[PDB]
Amino acid sequence: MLQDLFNNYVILVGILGLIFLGVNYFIVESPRMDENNGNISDYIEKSGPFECGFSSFEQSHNPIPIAFILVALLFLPFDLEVSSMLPYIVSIYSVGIYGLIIFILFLLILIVGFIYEFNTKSLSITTILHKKNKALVKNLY
Amino acid sequence: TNPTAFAQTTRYVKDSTEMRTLVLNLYRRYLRHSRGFVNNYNLDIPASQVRTKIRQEFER
Amino acid sequence: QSASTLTKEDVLTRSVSVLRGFEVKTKDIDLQTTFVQDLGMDSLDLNDALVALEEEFDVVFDDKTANEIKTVGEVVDFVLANYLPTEQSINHTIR
Amino acid sequence: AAQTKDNNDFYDVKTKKNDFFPVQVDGIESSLGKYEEFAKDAHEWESWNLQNEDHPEYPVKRTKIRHFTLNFGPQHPAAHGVLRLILELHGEEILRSDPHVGLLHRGTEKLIESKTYMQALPYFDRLDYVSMMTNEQVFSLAVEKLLNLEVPERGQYIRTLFGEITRVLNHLMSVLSHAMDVGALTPFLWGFEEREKLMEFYERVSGARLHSAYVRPGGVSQDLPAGLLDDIYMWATQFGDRLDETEELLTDSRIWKQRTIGIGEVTAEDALNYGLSGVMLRGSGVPFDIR
Amino acid sequence: EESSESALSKATKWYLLSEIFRGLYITLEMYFRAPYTIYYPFEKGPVSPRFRGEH
Amino acid sequence: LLASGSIGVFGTVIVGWMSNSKYTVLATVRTTAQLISYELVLTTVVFIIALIVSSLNINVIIESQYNIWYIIPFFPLCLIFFISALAETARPPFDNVEAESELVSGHMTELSASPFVIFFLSEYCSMVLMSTLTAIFFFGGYLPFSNTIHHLILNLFDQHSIYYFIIEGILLSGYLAIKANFFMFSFVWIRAAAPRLRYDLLILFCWYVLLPIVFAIVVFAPGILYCFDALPVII
Amino acid sequence: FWPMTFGLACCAVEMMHVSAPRYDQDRLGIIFRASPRQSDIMIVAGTVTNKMAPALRQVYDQMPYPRWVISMGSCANGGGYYHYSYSVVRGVDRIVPVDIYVPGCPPTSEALMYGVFQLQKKMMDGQTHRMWYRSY
Amino acid sequence: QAQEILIKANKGNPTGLTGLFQHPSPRPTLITLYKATLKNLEEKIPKESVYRTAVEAFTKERLSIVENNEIIEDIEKKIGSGLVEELIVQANEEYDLIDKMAEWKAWEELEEKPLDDQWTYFGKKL
Amino acid sequence: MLFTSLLLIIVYGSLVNKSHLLTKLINRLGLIIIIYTLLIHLNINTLENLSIGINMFNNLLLINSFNNTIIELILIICILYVLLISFNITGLSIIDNLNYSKRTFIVIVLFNIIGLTLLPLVNDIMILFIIIELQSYSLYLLTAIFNESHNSTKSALYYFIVGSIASFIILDATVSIYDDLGLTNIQYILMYIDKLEIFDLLCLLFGLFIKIGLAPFYSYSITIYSLSPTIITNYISLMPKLSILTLIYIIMHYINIVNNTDLNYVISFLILISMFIGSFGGLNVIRIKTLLAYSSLLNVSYMLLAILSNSNESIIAYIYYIIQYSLTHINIFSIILVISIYLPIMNNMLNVMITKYSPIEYINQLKNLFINNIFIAIALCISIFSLIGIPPLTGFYGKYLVLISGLNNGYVLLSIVLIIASSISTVYYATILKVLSFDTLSFKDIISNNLIINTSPENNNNEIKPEISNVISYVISSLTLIILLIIIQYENIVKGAYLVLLYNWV
Numbered sequence A: 001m002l003q004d005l006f007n008n009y010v011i012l013v014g015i016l017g018l019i020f021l022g023v024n025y026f027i028v029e030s031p032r033m034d035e036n037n038g039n040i041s042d043y044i045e046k047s048g049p050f051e052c053g054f055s056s057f058e059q060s061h062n063p064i065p066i067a068f069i070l071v072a073l074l075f076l077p078f079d080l081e082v083s084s085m086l087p088y089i090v091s092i093y094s095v096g097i098y099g100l101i102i103f104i105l106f107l108l109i110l111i112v113g114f115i116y117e118f119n120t121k122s123l124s125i126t127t128i129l130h131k132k133n134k135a136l137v138k139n140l141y
Numbered sequence B: 001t002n003p004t005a006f007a008q009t010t011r012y013v014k015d016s017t018e019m020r021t022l023v024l025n026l027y028r029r030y031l032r033h034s035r036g037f038v039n040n041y042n043l044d045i046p047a048s049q050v051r052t053k054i055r056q057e058f059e060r
Numbered sequence C: 001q002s003a004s005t006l007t008k009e010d011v012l013t014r015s016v017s018v019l020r021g022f023e024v025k026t027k028d029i030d031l032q033t034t035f036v037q038d039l040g041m042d043s044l045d046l047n048d049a050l051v052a053l054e055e056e057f058d059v060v061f062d063d064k065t066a067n068e069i070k071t072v073g074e075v076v077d078f079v080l081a082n083y084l085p086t087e088q089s090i091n092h093t094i095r
Numbered sequence D: 001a002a003q004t005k006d007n008n009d010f011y012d013v014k015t016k017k018n019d020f021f022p023v024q025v026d027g028i029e030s031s032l033g034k035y036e037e038f039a040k041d042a043h044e045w046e047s048w049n050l051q052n053e054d055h056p057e058y059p060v061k062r063t064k065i066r067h068f069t070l071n072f073g074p075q076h077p078a079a080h081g082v083l084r085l086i087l088e089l090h091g092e093e094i095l096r097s098d099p100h101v102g103l104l105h106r107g108t109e110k111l112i113e114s115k116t117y118m119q120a121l122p123y124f125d126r127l128d129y130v131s132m133m134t135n136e137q138v139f140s141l142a143v144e145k146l147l148n149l150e151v152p153e154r155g156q157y158i159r160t161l162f163g164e165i166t167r168v169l170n171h172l173m174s175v176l177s178h179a180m181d182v183g184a185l186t187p188f189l190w191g192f193e194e195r196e197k198l199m200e201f202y203e204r205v206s207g208a209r210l211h212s213a214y215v216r217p218g219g220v221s222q223d224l225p226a227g228l229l230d231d232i233y234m235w236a237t238q239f240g241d242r243l244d245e246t247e248e249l250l251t252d253s254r255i256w257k258q259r260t261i262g263i264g265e266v267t268a269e270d271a272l273n274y275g276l277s278g279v280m281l282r283g284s285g286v287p288f289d290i291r
Numbered sequence E: 001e002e003s004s005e006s007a008l009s010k011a012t013k014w015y016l017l018s019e020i021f022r023g024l025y026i027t028l029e030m031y032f033r034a035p036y037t038i039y040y041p042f043e044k045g046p047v048s049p050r051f052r053g054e055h
Numbered sequence F: 001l002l003a004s005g006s007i008g009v010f011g012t013v014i015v016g017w018m019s020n021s022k023y024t025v026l027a028t029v030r031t032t033a034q035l036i037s038y039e040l041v042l043t044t045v046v047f048i049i050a051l052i053v054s055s056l057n058i059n060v061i062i063e064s065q066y067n068i069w070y071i072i073p074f075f076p077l078c079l080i081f082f083i084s085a086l087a088e089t090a091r092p093p094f095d096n097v098e099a100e101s102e103l104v105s106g107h108m109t110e111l112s113a114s115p116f117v118i119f120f121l122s123e124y125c126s127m128v129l130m131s132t133l134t135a136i137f138f139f140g141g142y143l144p145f146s147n148t149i150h151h152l153i154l155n156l157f158d159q160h161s162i163y164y165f166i167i168e169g170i171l172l173s174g175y176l177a178i179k180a181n182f183f184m185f186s187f188v189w190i191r192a193a194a195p196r197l198r199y200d201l202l203i204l205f206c207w208y209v210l211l212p213i214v215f216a217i218v219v220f221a222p223g224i225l226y227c228f229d230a231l232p233v234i235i
Numbered sequence G: 001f002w003p004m005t006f007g008l009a010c011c012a013v014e015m016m017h018v019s020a021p022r023y024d025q026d027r028l029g030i031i032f033r034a035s036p037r038q039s040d041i042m043i044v045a046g047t048v049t050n051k052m053a054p055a056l057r058q059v060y061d062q063m064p065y066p067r068w069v070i071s072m073g074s075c076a077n078g079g080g081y082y083h084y085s086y087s088v089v090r091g092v093d094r095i096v097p098v099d100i101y102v103p104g105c106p107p108t109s110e111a112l113m114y115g116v117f118q119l120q121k122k123m124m125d126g127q128t129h130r131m132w133y134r135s136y
Numbered sequence H: 001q002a003q004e005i006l007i008k009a010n011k012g013n014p015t016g017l018t019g020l021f022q023h024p025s026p027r028p029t030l031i032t033l034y035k036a037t038l039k040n041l042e043e044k045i046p047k048e049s050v051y052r053t054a055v056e057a058f059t060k061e062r063l064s065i066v067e068n069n070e071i072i073e074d075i076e077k078k079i080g081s082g083l084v085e086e087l088i089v090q091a092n093e094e095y096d097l098i099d100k101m102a103e104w105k106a107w108e109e110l111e112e113k114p115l116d117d118q119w120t121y122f123g124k125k126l
Numbered sequence I: 001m002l003f004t005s006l007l008l009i010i011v012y013g014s015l016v017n018k019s020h021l022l023t024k025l026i027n028r029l030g031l032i033i034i035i036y037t038l039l040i041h042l043n044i045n046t047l048e049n050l051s052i053g054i055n056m057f058n059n060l061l062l063i064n065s066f067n068n069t070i071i072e073l074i075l076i077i078c079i080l081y082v083l084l085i086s087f088n089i090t091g092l093s094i095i096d097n098l099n100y101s102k103r104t105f106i107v108i109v110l111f112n113i114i115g116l117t118l119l120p121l122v123n124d125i126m127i128l129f130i131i132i133e134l135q136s137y138s139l140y141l142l143t144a145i146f147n148e149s150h151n152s153t154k155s156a157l158y159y160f161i162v163g164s165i166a167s168f169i170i171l172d173a174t175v176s177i178y179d180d181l182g183l184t185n186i187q188y189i190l191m192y193i194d195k196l197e198i199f200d201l202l203c204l205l206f207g208l209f210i211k212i213g214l215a216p217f218y219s220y221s222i223t224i225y226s227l228s229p230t231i232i233t234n235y236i237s238l239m240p241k242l243s244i245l246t247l248i249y250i251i252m253h254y255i256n257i258v259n260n261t262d263l264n265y266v267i268s269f270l271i272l273i274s275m276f277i278g279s280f281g282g283l284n285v286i287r288i289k290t291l292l293a294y295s296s297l298l299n300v301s302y303m304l305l306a307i308l309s310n311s312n313e314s315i316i317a318y319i320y321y322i323i324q325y326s327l328t329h330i331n332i333f334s335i336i337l338v339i340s341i342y343l344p345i346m347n348n349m350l351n352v353m354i355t356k357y358s359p360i361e362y363i364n365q366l367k368n369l370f371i372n373n374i375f376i377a378i379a380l381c382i383s384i385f386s387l388i389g390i391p392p393l394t395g396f397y398g399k400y401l402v403l404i405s406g407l408n409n410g411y412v413l414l415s416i417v418l419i420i421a422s423s424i425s426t427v428y429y430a431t432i433l434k435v436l437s438f439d440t441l442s443f444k445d446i447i448s449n450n451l452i453i454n455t456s457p458e459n460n461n462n463e464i465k466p467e468i469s470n471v472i473s474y475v476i477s478s479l480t481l482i483i484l485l486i487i488i489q490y491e492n493i494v495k496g497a498y499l500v501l502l503y504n505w506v
C-alpha cells in the first residue's frame, strides 16, 4: 500500500482552505472604495455582538447550566465499549465460538449498566422547575 | 405570573414620615447601582458624576 | 479561607479616611463622632457617606440600620459583625 | 422586598435550617496546650478550623448573578413582527418571561379621536393586519349600534361571507406560520397560494389586496362585482383538498405531536381569569363563541 | 388492556415510521404537479377596475 | 472515516469560544448534545456492516455486496444510518443547531463572508459524503444495478484502448452517482416533509430506542453467521 | 440578493407573498437571512417607532458592506397614516440611508419586486474597481 | 371541630374541562357546604339584607336537589349551573362571599356618594 | 460469588422503591454475600495446598499461602464494616439514617472488595495496572458517595487527582520495564531480574507509596481522612493498606533477589521521614480523625520496616501486625461512632459547627466518657494502650515482632528511631486517655439532662432499655477482649504465622 498520492491530497486540502480566506481578503474592495466608514476594528457598532436589536447584559463568561450533563458523561463509558468491539470485528473467524461467547459475555456485562440507566431514569433531562397541581381543601368548622 | 426583577408592589402611603423613609431607601439604591449604571450602559463619565446627577434630580 | 480579617483599629482608620473626602465640618473623627451634629450632614449627605462607606468595606447596610445609625462607632461595629469575604471560584481555593 | 443584612440587591447569605443536634463543644485542646494558646497561629492551620462548610448555617457571601438573559427581540423570525421577549433562562428552561411590547405602538387610539367615524375606519385595517375585514366589522357594528341603524339583509350576508373568508385568511397565516416556526416549511408555501386566491377576492370588491376599507358603518363600501360568487364557489370546491393535504403532514405526524401535545397547557379556570378567548378559551373545554 | 390494535401492529407502525412515509409520499405528489409561479415582469397578476395605485 | 468525521464536531464548538453572542453560545450546547446522540448509534451501525464482512476496508465492503445488497438483510440499519446521518449533519428534522426560528442562525449568526462560506461548504460536503456512504454500505457502492447491462455497454469498447477505461470509470461512478443522488434527494425530501424535532427529544430517541436496537443486532448477526458456519473472512 | 428578515407591520405580509409560490423570490436568487452578518439588503417593511428606532440603527450597523436599504410602504417612507403620531418616526431615512422607496399601503408583491429590480439595475451599474483606476 | 373538605381534586378522571378533575364524593361534599352556608348566613348577616334573602332561597333549592337525586346527571340537569365538580367550586365561593359580605357590612347606607358633576357627560346628567 | 451476587444487587436496588428500610435490608444482603464468599473461599483454598503457589487465568494471577491469608483477612474485616451499615450504631434516626440514605453504598463496597482481593494476586504488569485502577476508582466513588456534602466531594476530587498521578507513575514504571525486556508476565520478568533496571521497580513502589499516604506524600491522606465522614474514613483509611502493603511485600520479595543496597537506602530514607512526621505531626492537632490519620501513617511505617527487611521473621511480623492493627482500627472507629450519643446539646463562644456526617470531630468531644459509659471508655483505653504498645496487648507483640525483623536484618538506625517515634507518639495517644478519665472525680457529682441520648423516648418506663444496640456493642466487646487477652492464645497464633510461606519451602 503506497500513500504518496494520499499525502499530496492532504497537502492540497490544507492549502485549499487558505485559498478561500486569501481570495476573500484580496477580492473585497477597500473601505475607501466603500462608504469609507474606516476599519472594522474601529466600527464598534458593527463588530459588537448581535442581540436582535437591543443590547443586553454581557454574560460571555457566566456559567451555563447543562441539563444533559449526565448523558454527556455517560457517553464516555459507552464510547469505550463501542471502541473495544473493533478487535472482534476483524478477528471474528479466528476466535471462533470461544471469542463469540467472550464477546457476548462482554456485552452481557455492559447491558447491566444499560438496565441500571433505564431504571434510574438518568437519561432524562433535569429541570429546576416542577409543575404540580395542588388540591384545594376547605377547613370547614 | 411572577413579577420581574426589582419590581415593587404599588402602595399609597398615608403617613408623611413613612414616605420620607421610602425615599431615603430608594435614594441609597440609586447610589449603590451607580457603578452598575456606568458598566451596563458604557458611559463616558465616572460613577462619581452619576451620583452627583442622581443627587441633583432628587434635590429638585 | 472564607473568614473576616478585619480589626477595630483598621476599620476605624479607613472609616475616617473615607469621611475626610467629604465636606465635613471637622477632620477630628472618632468612634463617638456623630454624623448629624459633629459632621454637619443632612439627609442626603449622610446617605452619600453611608454608601461611600459601603464601597470601602464591600458591605451593605440594611434599611433599619441605615435609618437609625447615629455615630461612626455604630458604623464600625456593623462592619466588624457583618463583613464577609466574597466567595471565590472553585479554582482559587483548591489548586 | 427591602434591603436586609442577609439579603440585598448585590449578594445574600443563605443559611438552611439545621438538620442535626446543636452539639456543644467546649475546651478545645491539643496534646501541647489549649486552643486559646495556639489560636493566634491557627489561621495558618486548616486542621484547626472550627467551622464546617457542610453545616447548613455556614456563612457564605454569594454574589447575586442574573440568569441567562436572552432577548427574543424584534430581529428574530420566531417573533411575528416586533417583540422584545426577555427570557430568564437556566440553560434552555424558561424561568421567567417578560414580553416587552410597544415597538409597534403608533398611537392609533389617540389619532382616531381627531378623525371622523369614516376617517377612523382605515385605522382598524392596520391593527390585525391579516384579518382586516373582521377588524372593520367590529368597529362598524359599534357605530351602527350607536347610530341605532340596521344593515340590510344583503349587506349582512356580504360581511358574513367575507367575515369567514377573512377567518380562512387569518388561520392560513396563523396555523402555517406556527407550523413554519416549529419546522414545517412546506405547508406554509401550499397555503399561501390559497391566500393569493382569497386576496384576489379582496381586491376585486375593494381594489386593495390587504387594507380593503370595505366594511363601513352602515353596510359595505360597494356592491359585489358580477361573477364574484361563481369565482368564490369554484375556489370553494377545491379548498377542501388543500386542507386535507395540510393535515397529511401535521395532524398524525409523530414529530408534530411531540412539539404540541402537553405544551402550553391552560386550565379552563385560568383561561377565564386571564381573559383568554377564542381557540385559547375553547381549547380548555369551554364552548363559548361570540357568533 | 383496551387497545384495538395489537402490540406487534402498533410496534410495526412505530418502528417503520408509517405516518412519516405517508407524509413523504404526499410531498412527492406535488413534485409532479404544475407550480403556481408567474414570471414577473414578463407576466402580471390579476387586476380589477377598482384597484388603487398611483394618483 | 469515523475518526475524521469526529474532528469536524470540534470545528463547530470552536465558534463558541467564550463568545459574547448569546445565540452562538446556545448553538454550541445543542451541538454537543446532538453529538452524544448520533455518535454512538452511527459508529455501531458501521461496525455491524464491518463485522458482517470482517473487514474495516471500504473497498472490501463494496465488493462483498456483489450477490446481495445490504439494504435487504439490514433494512432497519439503513434507516438508522440515515437518521444518524441527518443528526450528524444537523439537517432537519434534527436542525436544532441552526434553527432559524430558535437561534436565528446558530453558531453562524456572527459569521460573514469567507467564514460563512467555509462552514456552508463543509456542511454540504458532509451531506454529499453521508449520501455517498449510504450508497456504499447498503446499495453496493459502485456496483452496477444490472450485471447484464454493464457487460453489454463495455462490450462496445476495446479493452486494448484507453476509451474502455474512460467509459468504465463513467459507468462505475455513474452507478455510485445515481445511488448517491437518490439520498441527496432524500436529504432534501425529508426537509420538505417533516417538522423539526427538539434536541432533548433527540437525546431520548437515540439512547432509549436506537442504541438498544443496534446493540441487539450486533449480537443477532454473529449468532446467525456462526449457526450456519458462515463466519466472514477477507479474500 | 439576500435581504434580512426585518418585518415590522402589515408591509411585511406583502413581503411574505413575494416568497409565496406565485412569485417565488427564490427563483431570482433571493433568500431571507435572519442575521445582519449574512444579509446585504435591509428591507424596512412596517412602521418605525421611536421605541424601535435605536434597534433599527444597531441592526443596520451590524450588516457588513456592501449594504443597501429598501424603504417599503408609507410608514417607512414618510410615516403614512401615523405621520402625526407622538411615537412614530416620520420616515426611516431619518435613521438610515435609503437606496429605493417603494410606494403603496401596502405596496403590492409586484410593486416590491419592481423596486428590487430597480435596485438590481443600480447595482449592475456600479463601477467600484474602475473608480479606483480612473477616479483615484 | 375540623371538617376538612376537598373542593378541587388534583387527580382522577378528567371532566372535560382542563384542570378540573372528578370529585370522589360529589353528593356528601355539597350537602355539608350547603348546610354550612345556611348556618353562616343566620349568624353573620342580618335578616333585612337582600343578599341573605336571595342566597337562602337558592341554597335550599340546591340542597333539596342534592338530597333527593342519587344520579349525578339528574342533579346537574335540575340545578342547571354546570357539573357537580363546578357546583362544589360555586358552593365554596358563595360560602366565602358571605364571610366577606359580613365584614363589608354591605347592607348599610351608601359609604361614598358621588359628586354633583360626577356622572354627567357633555352637559347631560345621567 | 462476589461478581455474580453484585450484578443481582445492582439490578434489584434499581427496581424496588427508594426507602431507608429497603436500603438497610439490601445492606444485610451484602453482608450475606460476603459471608458466603468467605465460606466458599475457605472451602477451596487451604494454606497447605497453596504453599507452592498456583497460577490462574493464563498465569495472569498467582495465589500462594501469603496471598491467601490477606484475602481471608480482607473478607473478615469487610464483614465487620458492613455490620456498621447493616445494623444500628446509635439507635437514633437523626444519626443512623445517613448510612441508609445511599443505596449504592453496598454496591460500591462490593466493587472495591473485588479489587482489594485480586490486587495481591497480580502476576502480570497489564493486569497490575487494570486491578490497581479498579481498586482506585472504587475508592473515589465511595469517597464521593455523599454527593450532597461539600467536604465529601472536595475530598474525592483531591483523592482522584493524587491517585491518578500515582497510577500514572505505576503505569510509567510498568511501561519502562516492558521497554527494557518486552515481557509482561512477572514470572518471565523474574528471569531477567539481574538484567533490568531495578530502580524502575522503585518507581513502581513510589506510586504504591503515594496510595498508602507514605511521606513525603502524607499530606493528602491526612486532609482526606479528616474531611470525609467517619463512616467513610473508617473504610478508606484501612482497606487500601490491606492490599497495597501485601503487594509491596511481594514486589520487595522480588527486589531482594538482586539485593540492591541503594534501593534499600531510598526506602529507608522514606521510612525515616514518615516516622518523624507521623510522631511530631499529631502532637498539635485538635481533630480526632486528624490524630488517627497521623497514627495510621506511623503504623504503616512500622510495617514497612518489616517489609523492607523481607525475611522469614518479616512474614511473621507483617501478618500478625496487619491483622491486629485492623482489629484495633475497627474497634476505635466503632467506639467513635457510638459515643456520639453522649454529646451535649446547646440550649456561643468559638462558633463551633458540627455536622451530621462527623458528629465526633474533636478530641475534647470525648470528655467525661468514663462517667457516661465506663465499659466503653475502658474499651477505648485498651485500644489506645494497644496502639501505644503496652504489653501484653496485641500492639506490643506487633512492635515486638517488627523489631525482631528490623534488628535481624541490620536496620539498627530504623529500629532505634521507631522506638523514639513510639515514645513521641505516646504523648498524643495519652491525650485521648486524659480527656476520657482525668476529670472523673470532679464531674462525678454533675447533672447531664442535655445529652443526645436523653432525647430518645422511653417505651413504658418499666422496660430495661439498653443505650446501645445489640450488634455494635457485641462487636466492640469481642474486639476489646481479643486485644486484651491475646496472651492466652499468642503462642498458637504465631505458630500459624510460621506456616505462612512465600516461596520459602526449605
Ligand SMILES: CCCCCCCCCCCCCCCCCC(=O)OC[C@H](COP(=O)(O)OCCN)OC(=O)CCCCCCCCCCCCCCCCC
Residues within 6 Å of the ligand: I272, I275, I276, I279, I417, I420, I421
Ligand atoms: C537526661 C534525660 C534526657 C531526656 C531527653 C533527651 C533528649 C533531649 C533533647 C534536647 C534538645 C531539645 C531541647 C532543647 C530544644 C529547645 C527548643 C527551643 O528552644 O525552641 C525551638 C527552636 C527554635 O527556637 P525558638 O522557637 O525561637 O525558641 C526561643 C529560643 N530562644 O527550634 C529549633 O531550632 C530546633 C531545631 C529545628 C528542629 C530540628 C528537628 C530535627 C530532628 C531533631 C531530633 C528529633 C529526632 C526524632 C527521632 C524520631 C523521629 C524520627
Ligand SMILES: CCCCCCCCCCCC(=O)OC[C@H](COP(=O)(O)OCC[N+](C)(C)C)OC(=O)CCCCCCCCCCC
Residues within 6 Å of the ligand: E012, E013, E016, E017, E018, E019, E021, E022, E024, E025
Ligand atoms: C419497501 C421499502 C420502501 C418503503 C418502506 C416503508 C413503507 C412503510 C412501512 C410501514 C407501513 C405500515 O406500518 O403499514 C401500515 C400503514 C397504515 O395502515 P393502517 O393504519 O394499518 O391501515 C388500516 C387498516 N387497513 C390496511 C385495512 C386499511 O401503512 C402505511 O402508512 C403505508 C404507507 C404507504 C405510503 C408510502 C410508501 C412509499 C414510501 C416512500 C418511498 C420510499
Ligand SMILES: CCCCCCCCCCCC(=O)OC[C@H](COP(=O)(O)OCC[N+](C)(C)C)OC(=O)CCCCCCCCCCC
Residues within 6 Å of the ligand: D254, D255, D258, E014, E015, E016, E017, E020, F076, F077, F079, F080, F082, F083, F093, F186, F190, F197, F205, F209, F213
Ligand atoms: C427492529 C427494527 C428496527 C427498526 C429500525 C428503525 C427505527 C426507527 C425509529 C423508530 C422509533 C421512533 O421513531 O420513535 C419515535 C421517537 C420517540 O417517540 P416517543 O417519545 O417514544 O413517543 C412515541 C411512543 N409512544 C407512541 C408509545 C408514545 O421520536 C420520533 O418521532 C423520532 C422521529 C425520527 C424521524 C426520522 C425520519 C427520517 C427519514 C427516514 C426515512 C428515509
Ligand code: SF4
Residues within 6 Å of the ligand: D126, D211, G009, G010, G011, G012, G045, G046, G047, G072, G073, G074, G075, G076, G080, G081, G104, G105, G106, G107
Ligand atoms: S405603510 Fe400601510 S401597509 Fe405598510 S406598515 Fe404602514 S400601515 Fe401597514
